[PDB]
Amino acid sequence: ATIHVDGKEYEVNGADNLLEACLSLGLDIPYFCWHPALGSVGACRQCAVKQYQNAEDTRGRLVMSCMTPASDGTFISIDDEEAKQFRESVVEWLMTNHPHDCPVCEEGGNCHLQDMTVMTGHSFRRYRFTKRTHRNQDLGPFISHEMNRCIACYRCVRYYKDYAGGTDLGVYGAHDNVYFGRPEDGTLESEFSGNLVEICPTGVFTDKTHSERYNRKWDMQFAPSICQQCSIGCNISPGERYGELRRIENRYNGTVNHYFLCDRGRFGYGYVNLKDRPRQPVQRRGDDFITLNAEQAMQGAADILRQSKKVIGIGSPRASVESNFALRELVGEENFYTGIAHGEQERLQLALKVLREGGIYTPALREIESYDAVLVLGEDVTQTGARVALAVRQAVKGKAREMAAAQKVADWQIAAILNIGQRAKHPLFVTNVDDTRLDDIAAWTYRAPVEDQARLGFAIAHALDNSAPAVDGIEPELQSKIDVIVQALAGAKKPLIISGTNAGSLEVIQAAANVAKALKGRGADVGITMIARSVNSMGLGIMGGGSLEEALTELETGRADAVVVLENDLHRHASATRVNAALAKAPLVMVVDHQRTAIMENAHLVLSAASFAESDGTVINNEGRAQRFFQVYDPAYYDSKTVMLESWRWLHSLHSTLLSREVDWTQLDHVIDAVVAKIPELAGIKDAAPDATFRIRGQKLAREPHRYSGRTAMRANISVHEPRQPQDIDTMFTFSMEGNNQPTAHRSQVPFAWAPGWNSPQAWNKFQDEVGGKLRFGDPGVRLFETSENGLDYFTSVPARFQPQDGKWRIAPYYHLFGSDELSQRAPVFQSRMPQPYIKLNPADAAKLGVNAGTRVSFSYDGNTVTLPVEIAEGLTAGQVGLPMGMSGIAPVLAGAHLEDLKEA
Amino acid sequence: EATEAGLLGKNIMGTGFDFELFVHTGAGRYICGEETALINSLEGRRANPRSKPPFPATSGAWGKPTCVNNVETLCNVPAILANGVEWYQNISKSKDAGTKLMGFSGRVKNPGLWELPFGTTAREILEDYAGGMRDGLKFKAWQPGGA
Amino acid sequence: AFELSAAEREAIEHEMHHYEDPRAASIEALKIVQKQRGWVPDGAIHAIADVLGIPASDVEGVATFYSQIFRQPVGRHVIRYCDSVVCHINGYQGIQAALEKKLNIKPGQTTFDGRFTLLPTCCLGNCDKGPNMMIDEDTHAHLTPEAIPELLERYK
Ligand code: SF4
Ligand code: SF4
Ligand code: SF4
Ligand code: FES
Ligand code: FES
Ligand SMILES: [Ca+2]
């Protein structure tokens, strides 16, 4: 297609509309109601251009560029005087009722409405009458509501309802009293409600957690990082000010998480700002806790570790690849233990074997949206891998997309698409121990124990391919529903099988692998997704090591007299009594961590590690993508006595002091080279980001914007002498604005989006090759493994049906987006959002116990009696008891275990 | 009455055509008269109009093909099919075929509605049918087709 | 606080039978609840949503979009005087002044006895007989300001 804008010829995509085609060319057209992920609706009337019939036409006609196709031989003008006057008039109409709020508005300096007001050149007010005002609502702890600032662009309702699937946000009212909010006060119920703060072009929906400690966008220090709160690896831009992590912005990655995060990743960052974190090395001597600097901490630790006979190291899936590798090098390969339990490790290694040996392509998160049928087995995706659930919602709406494409309706005309595809949708079959948040769009939901979910998967695989092992004892009605699933999956051009390790069942993963193999054998373009538990679960699985039970065995038998625990609380993966006994028996415990955990009371030495905000490293996605996170700020810039080093730096210098009695604060690139030299299946992590010598025409990449303020006053209360700018030897980023952040710079790591004239999140348009596409020079991150040439064999270990045995209670895992992740549930704003700990019971089991809804029952696990109030779960099955995983006292390792002595307290 | 007389419902007049007719009472918005907003209000939604194309003929009520016509058009149809094309074309010597309900309202002698052929001048409507302005009133303006 | 009666639910389901989509009976369900109770209370929104299987925000958006679906409590009789251009020419201002003098309320308000709620409605479609008023179901045309203190006294 060829378009002519203002007499200049451009070659565009004819399937695009004119607004996105012209924004992809670098032309500036103001817009409000259009979003690249939401489509065109033509509400705000801001994007007007002048379209001419042909080259020899001068009159023309004002058209909405978002609603106009970029067809071949199109003639438009943006800088036409009539078009400019109309766009300025639209801005003026929006300005008539807008409140005088910019100094006390959290959107200021980050506001799309401010940018478009300046861009149209409207700065003179001639409206003299009153302004309409609105009451605000309480939307919960995360989103602050300020309805006066609304321009009625309908982006919030289109995102929250049509895109995200939420039900409790809407538009109410009429002519000019349109109200965007909830029907009543209350917490917004969607797991993706936090994206409203970037979807809303004004300051109606604002980050309340940021608003408590507000600072402007130009005052932030940003870095490109990876969210640490689950395994999806969404790209984030954490920004800090005055030594504390202030905000998490979405960092655009066209391959992973393009515009959206979930609320856990957006709002669970508050554990970084906790005041009980270790900020200096501490050695316990007697009852005293002597504070050390880095040098003498390394010397004393090296002396005690040299005096010991065997040293073991316990890693964590929280820690990065470099940190776990450094611990593995310090203690030796045979003495290194993954910090997760044996069953967790077995399920994780099986998921890895399916991903990198099953011969079936594992999609990226953006690619999930293009699949034609989804089967989810055992994985409560919305509570464990939430952005996969959002992508699955888009994949389900793909059927309405196809039906509208059959009637020659353009891809961006979203309202016509939703009108054609009324309630038709692609098949979704979810399986869980209870109801999920995907049940509203699921074609079928199977609520069953994990044995029965695995049996359903094996039966589906056998019905698709008779070479798969058969299942004996399927009821005829369940068989009919299985046949419905098989007809939906066999007719799909791109079926997608999603499972994961959060079900606590190996057989569920085996059944999902069998279904994916059966669909692969029929010629389908099948994909398989595995949801792991933690940010670097897949990296820890690739690195390998013994289980936590083997490490505790070594500590309890006395074969190991020194243990180094890296970023692991050890109570989420084993019983707390056994961990406490093993750590009390060991004469040397050294905890390298950034959070105050319960095992530090047994620790002889505590090394104050850095969090993701204060460290660099590599983490491995649930799809096997290696991604770097870069340090946001120097922790010692404000508090000079803070000794908070990276975990790989601590462990590498400790290894160097153990060998040659000299400390060695290494560089990140050296550790990455060591990883790719010693572990060949982690060799892809070298290409995740360029090394520290990378430059854009000789200069580094800036962490903070050009207008960063307070350079000679922010530390002036400590000392009037401005300190040295902190030097970053690990990465290509600088701790200053003396660097490059151009949208046209040849790089993939973008710390934050800013363009002149574009201060809002809409500045990401300048950083993309096409708007809503990829980044201009490729998205960051690299897949570690390719699709295998040959797949696996069928798993023949079909489990038996679940049998409720008296006295025992199978623990059904219930996951929560706010509470199940360890560090995020340590964040203070999650405590208001955290549900009360309820033990979930079947009505029949509660009637057998005599227990009603709300009475407190006591149950003993590992000889420890704990008491919880009862919530009746109708979707649960008899003989199972539902427990909230990862909460206070309930470890996620309890999933699949049995329970004893359940009685009323 | 038309249902109990066999004119509506299943197998009308023995042809085999099934047609069911419903009456949907609105809840009072002027924008509901706009045909795409009418379709939105029929679907139980807020009566925002829809952008065209696509027109309701291809994707209308609940995505199905839908045709929206005024009361007077559908009242013109039965006489057309009961008398013929040439009768409907031979009642007015104008480019607009057929008759139309026209009438003057507001401070006139006889406000009301009369069926007149197209091409009738407004002055003769006001003076003959409406009777002209009332006593002691001077005509200064008029609107031909509503607000 | 709110519970739909059996007759209300039966009427709502009967209206749901008339449409391809159960969402399309939202306006009729709101009008049924309003007819039975004078107005649509706050719990009725979630009750209608639960019966129809649509979100409560959709029901609330429908109820607040349409001016005839009352969302605040009203009086026993709703006076709806016409406001549009033809009744402006025919002198609806005298009728509005007579109503405000007789009832001592501004438009949009309810009398202290809870008897009348005064509302300026749109054009009533009776322009050749203006000015027009619509009390609860009855349209009164050819209004004069002297006939209001007789017209309002047969609606007890
Ligand atoms: S929303 Fe934007 S324009 Fe409105 S007060 Fe806030 S910063 Fe100013
Ligand atoms: S609240 Fe924000 S996103 Fe929603 S219509 Fe108003 S300005 Fe647009
Ligand atoms: S889906 Fe996972 S990785 Fe993405 S924002 Fe949420 S917690 Fe973070
Ligand atoms: S962006 Fe085109 S009208 Fe809103
Ligand atoms: S203008 Fe009042 S009835 Fe039409
Ligand atoms: Ca660093």
Coordinates of all heavy atoms in Angstrom, one line a residue, chain A residues 17 19 29-35 39-48 63-67 153 155, ligand 4:
Chain A
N17 N -4.8 0.8 10.1 CA -5.5 2.1 9.9 C -4.5 3.2 9.8 O -3.3 3.0 10.0 CB -6.5 2.3 11.1 CG -5.8 2.3 12.4 OD1 -5.2 3.3 12.8 ND2 -5.8 1.2 13.2
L19 N -4.0 6.0 11.5 CA -3.4 6.5 12.7 C -2.2 5.6 13.1 O -1.1 6.2 13.3 CB -4.4 6.5 13.9 CG -3.8 6.9 15.2 CD1 -3.2 8.3 15.1 CD2 -4.8 6.9 16.3
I29 N 0.3 12.4 15.2 CA -1.2 12.7 15.1 C -1.7 12.6 16.6 O -1.4 11.5 17.2 CB -2.0 11.8 14.2 CG1 -1.3 11.7 12.8 CG2 -3.4 12.3 14.0 CD1 -2.0 10.8 11.8
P30 N -2.3 13.6 17.1 CA -2.9 13.4 18.5 C -4.0 12.4 18.5 O -4.8 12.3 17.5 CB -3.4 14.8 18.8 CG -2.8 15.7 17.8 CD -2.5 14.9 16.6
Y31 N -4.2 11.7 19.6 CA -5.2 10.7 19.7 C -5.5 10.4 21.2 O -4.6 10.6 22.0 CB -4.8 9.4 19.0 CG -3.6 8.7 19.6 CD1 -3.7 7.7 20.6 CD2 -2.3 9.1 19.2 CE1 -2.6 7.1 21.2 CE2 -1.2 8.5 19.8 CZ -1.4 7.5 20.7 OH -0.3 6.9 21.3
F32 N -6.7 10.1 21.5 CA -7.0 9.6 22.9 C -7.6 8.2 22.9 O -7.1 7.3 23.5 CB -7.9 10.6 23.6 CG -7.2 11.9 23.9 CD1 -7.5 13.0 23.2 CD2 -6.3 11.9 24.9 CE1 -6.9 14.2 23.5 CE2 -5.6 13.1 25.2 CZ -6.0 14.2 24.5
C33 N -8.7 8.0 22.2 CA -9.5 6.8 22.4 C -8.9 5.5 21.7 O -9.3 4.4 22.0 CB -10.9 7.0 21.9 SG -11.2 6.9 20.1
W34 N -7.9 5.7 20.9 CA -7.3 4.6 20.2 C -6.1 4.1 21.1 O -5.4 4.8 21.7 CB -6.7 4.9 18.9 CG -5.9 3.9 18.2 CD1 -6.4 2.8 17.5 CD2 -4.5 3.8 18.2 NE1 -5.4 2.1 17.0 CE2 -4.2 2.6 17.4 CE3 -3.5 4.5 18.7 CZ2 -2.9 2.2 17.2 CZ3 -2.2 4.1 18.5 CH2 -1.9 3.0 17.7
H35 N -6.0 2.7 21.2 CA -4.8 2.1 21.8 C -4.4 1.0 20.9 O -5.3 0.4 20.2 CB -5.2 1.6 23.2 CG -4.0 1.2 24.0 ND1 -3.4 -0.1 23.9 CD2 -3.2 1.8 24.9 CE1 -2.4 -0.2 24.7 NE2 -2.2 1.0 25.3
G39 N -7.8 -1.5 19.7 CA -8.5 -1.2 18.5 C -9.0 0.2 18.4 O -8.8 1.0 19.3
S40 N -9.8 0.4 17.3 CA -10.3 1.7 17.0 C -11.8 1.8 17.3 O -12.5 0.8 16.9 CB -10.0 2.1 15.6 OG -8.6 2.0 15.3
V41 N -12.3 2.8 17.9 CA -13.7 3.0 18.1 C -14.2 4.4 17.7 O -15.4 4.6 17.6 CB -14.0 2.8 19.6 CG1 -13.9 1.3 20.0 CG2 -13.1 3.6 20.5
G42 N -13.3 5.3 17.5 CA -13.7 6.6 17.0 C -14.4 7.5 18.0 O -15.3 8.2 17.6
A43 N -14.1 7.4 19.3 CA -14.9 8.2 20.3 C -14.4 9.6 20.4 O -15.1 10.6 20.2 CB -14.8 7.5 21.6
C44 N -13.1 9.8 20.7 CA -12.6 11.1 21.1 C -12.5 12.1 20.0 O -12.5 13.3 20.3 CB -11.2 10.9 21.7 SG -9.9 10.5 20.5
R45 N -12.6 11.7 18.7 CA -12.5 12.6 17.5 C -11.3 13.4 17.5 O -11.3 14.5 16.8 CB -13.8 13.4 17.4 CG -15.1 12.7 17.6 CD -15.3 11.5 16.8 NE -15.6 11.8 15.4 CZ -15.9 10.9 14.4 NH1 -15.9 9.6 14.7 NH2 -16.1 11.3 13.2
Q46 N -10.2 13.0 18.1 CA -9.0 13.8 18.1 C -8.1 13.6 16.9 O -7.3 14.5 16.6 CB -8.2 13.5 19.4 CG -6.9 14.2 19.7 CD -7.2 15.7 19.8 OE1 -7.8 16.2 20.8 NE2 -6.7 16.5 18.9
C47 N -8.1 12.4 16.3 CA -7.2 12.0 15.3 C -7.5 12.4 13.9 O -7.1 11.8 12.9 CB -7.0 10.5 15.3 SG -8.5 9.6 14.8
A48 N -8.2 13.5 13.7 CA -8.7 13.9 12.4 C -7.6 14.4 11.5 O -6.7 15.1 11.9 CB -9.7 15.1 12.6
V63 N -11.4 13.2 8.1 CA -11.7 11.8 8.5 C -11.0 11.4 9.7 O -10.0 12.0 10.1 CB -11.4 10.8 7.3 CG1 -12.2 11.0 6.1 CG2 -9.9 10.9 7.0
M64 N -11.5 10.5 10.5 CA -10.8 9.9 11.6 C -9.8 8.9 11.1 O -10.1 7.9 10.5 CB -11.8 9.2 12.6 CG -12.6 10.1 13.4 SD -11.7 11.3 14.3 CE -12.4 12.8 13.7
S65 N -8.5 9.2 11.4 CA -7.4 8.4 10.9 C -7.4 7.0 11.6 O -6.9 6.1 11.0 CB -6.1 9.1 11.1 OG -5.8 9.4 12.5
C66 N -7.9 6.9 12.8 CA -7.9 5.6 13.5 C -9.0 4.7 12.9 O -8.9 3.5 12.9 CB -8.2 5.8 15.0 SG -9.8 6.3 15.5
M67 N -10.0 5.3 12.3 CA -11.1 4.5 11.6 C -11.0 4.4 10.1 O -11.9 3.9 9.5 CB -12.5 5.1 12.0 CG -12.7 5.2 13.5 SD -13.0 3.6 14.3 CE -14.5 3.1 13.6
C153 N -12.8 9.0 27.2 CA -12.2 8.4 26.0 C -12.5 6.9 25.9 O -12.2 6.3 24.9 CB -10.7 8.6 26.0 SG -9.8 7.5 27.2
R155 N -11.3 4.3 27.2 CA -10.2 3.3 27.1 C -10.3 2.4 28.3 O -9.9 1.2 28.2 CB -8.9 4.1 27.1 CG -8.0 3.8 25.9 CD -7.2 5.0 25.6 NE -5.8 4.9 26.1 CZ -4.7 5.0 25.4 NH1 -4.8 5.4 24.1 NH2 -3.5 4.9 25.9
Ligands
FES4 S1 -8.1 8.2 18.3 FE1 -9.4 8.3 16.5 S2 -11.3 9.3 17.2 FE2 -10.1 8.7 19.0

